[PDB]
Symmetry: C3
Subunit: 126 residues, 3 copies
């Protein structure tokens, strides 16, 4: 089991999908979620990464941008540079394992000039 | 391990591919298999999730429709409302965990009016 | 954990990307790496499959070509037949688990007439 096993729908990985607004997240499978982000966008992603309340007290995860992904038409696109993720105000790097308490704010930012998709993969949990 | 380690070919997740018939399933990796379905299609999927006789014992898996995926030319598509899976004549809701004894029939249906892709993720087994 | 957690970027699975050269590798998630190959290409893949020096020292993996993937504009493509991988000079079939030490040469080949994408999935490592 992974924290997102009970999601009732998943989506294809790497396909940009943000129908209204500037950010949108969805699940890929039990352990991976992705947030599609327009240019110059920022948002909080707690509701998305958090396992259902009462289920966990701590989640371990890593994040990273997708070097290549696609637009709604099937065309290749590359993530903007300068994407960041802060956990409890601390800026966390892509590739580093971060211990999240389930409570603290996880902010995601895409200051860059093109669209980007960020992936969060939950590692071990409990 | 995972039950489908050993499949000899996998495919890109979320890409609609039904060359012959009204349904087709394939593997995505060791714990995940997807099944593409045309509008108003039904299919039995035991042989796909039935790993190989003797190794298998009992399988616990979840299934969920893909909210967005693509057609063979790369355009975004959304799964039709109304998909269902019955495991041994019992209706299983997306996201509910199901114990499968490996022998009962797993039916899959897409009574709706557009294509859909269903994902089956295997959580544990032995 | 998994060996490719630590990779600082990932890419969409099954989307052909080889901007300069005959083959290119990238990571999909913590246990999976994909290598795109132009028609009639070969290359050595150690640098991609190797967990960083000192961490791991024995990797078990399986590899398999993708039956269907896409080109950069999103159209469906099928992997050419005849793909092969050799680990320390031995031929390893798709679907077979191979034990690797991180040192021995891993050759990859696409003798066929068209593009292909091979998948390497790491199963355990101690």
């Amino acid at each position: 089991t992974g924290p997102y096993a009970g999601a009732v729908e998943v989506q294809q990985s790497g396909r940009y999908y943000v129908p209204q607004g500037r950010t949108r997240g969805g699940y890929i499978n039990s352990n991976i979620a992705e947030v599609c982000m327009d240019a110059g966008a920022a948002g909080q992603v707690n509701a998305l990464l958090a396992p259902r309340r009462g289920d966990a007290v701590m989640i371990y995860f890593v994040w990273r941008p997708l070097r290549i992904f696609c637009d709604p038409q099937g065309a290749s696109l590359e993530s903007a540079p300068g994407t960041f993720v802060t956990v409890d105000g601390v800026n966390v790097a892509a590739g580093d394992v971060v211990a999240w308490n389930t409570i603290a704010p996880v902010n995601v930012g895409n200051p860059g000039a093109r669209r980007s998709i960020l992936q969060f993969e939950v590692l071990w949990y409990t």
